[PDB]
Amino acid sequence: MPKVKRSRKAPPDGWELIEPTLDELDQKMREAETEPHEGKRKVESLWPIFRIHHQKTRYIFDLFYKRKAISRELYEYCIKEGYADKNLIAKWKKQGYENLCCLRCIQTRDTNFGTNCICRVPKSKLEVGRIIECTHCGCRGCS
RNA sequence: GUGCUCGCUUCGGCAGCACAUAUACUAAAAUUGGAACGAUACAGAGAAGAUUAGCAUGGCCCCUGCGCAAGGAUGACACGCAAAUUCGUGAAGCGUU
Ligand SMILES: [Mg+2]
Ligand SMILES: [Mg+2]
Ligand SMILES: [Mg+2]
Ligand SMILES: [Zn+2]
Ligand SMILES: [Zn+2]
Ligand SMILES: [Zn+2]
């Protein structure tokens, strides 16, 4: 029923107060894996995976850098077990990059002209009020 | 969005600055045509009597094979009243200058 752990040592100290929500996020991810595509476009059906992955990683990130509610050990346990993304966090700690979607949406090898997605353009520099949905992600304006 | 402003100056708002700067064969489609054996009837395997191994050759014919191997009926086709330049003799009869 839960995620099979791969550490086999017991989880660290403050585990028991973050587990209902981690399992609730984990139950939410298993919904999105099994949704049948019908009226969902070919790229659109993968958008919930990136959203929930953002959410799980944001949750551990808030409990350790904002709320200071978790030690290094419980933090690095959640990264090793796959609850949080190590690389997505390392971009959120950068200066401009603090509500980033994905690592796809800043990867310049993934685009034709070698650039970020329009996801990453500040909404004030589009100056028109056009509506954006990133094809990688579904995002409407990180930056 | 975040941070810094000995910014107004409260913790409400605003101002300034810094970082952050252009995805997508753009459809979950509408269309548009050419196509699956294989069944339907027909159809029957070259070499001058008959029964037959085959190896080629040529290209707006392909199939199987990774093949510059080898197979596919010798893989099939090829079977054509197969006419390409350029004429003269001799007498004989009839009409004519
Ligand atoms: Mg042969
Ligand atoms: Mg034979
Ligand atoms: Mg032959
Ligand atoms: Zn994204
Ligand atoms: Zn994006
Ligand atoms: Zn985004």
UniProtKB/Swiss-Prot annotation:
Matches recorded under Pfam families: BUD31
N6-acetyllysine carried by residues: K125
MF GO annotations: nuclear receptor binding; transcription coactivator activity
Sequence motif Nuclear localization signal, location on chain: 2-10
Assembly information from the UniProt record: Identified in the spliceosome C complex. May interact with AR.
Function: Involved in the pre-mRNA splicing process. May play a role as regulator of AR transcriptional activity; may increase AR transcriptional activity.
Recorded domain comment: Contains a short sequence motif (Phe-Xaa-Xaa-Phe-Tyr) that can bind to AR and may modulate AR activity.
PANTHER family in the record: PROTEIN BUD31 HOMOLOG, PROTEIN BUD31-RELATED
Protein name as catalogued: Protein BUD31 homolog
Organism name: Homo sapiens (Human)
Gene: BUD31
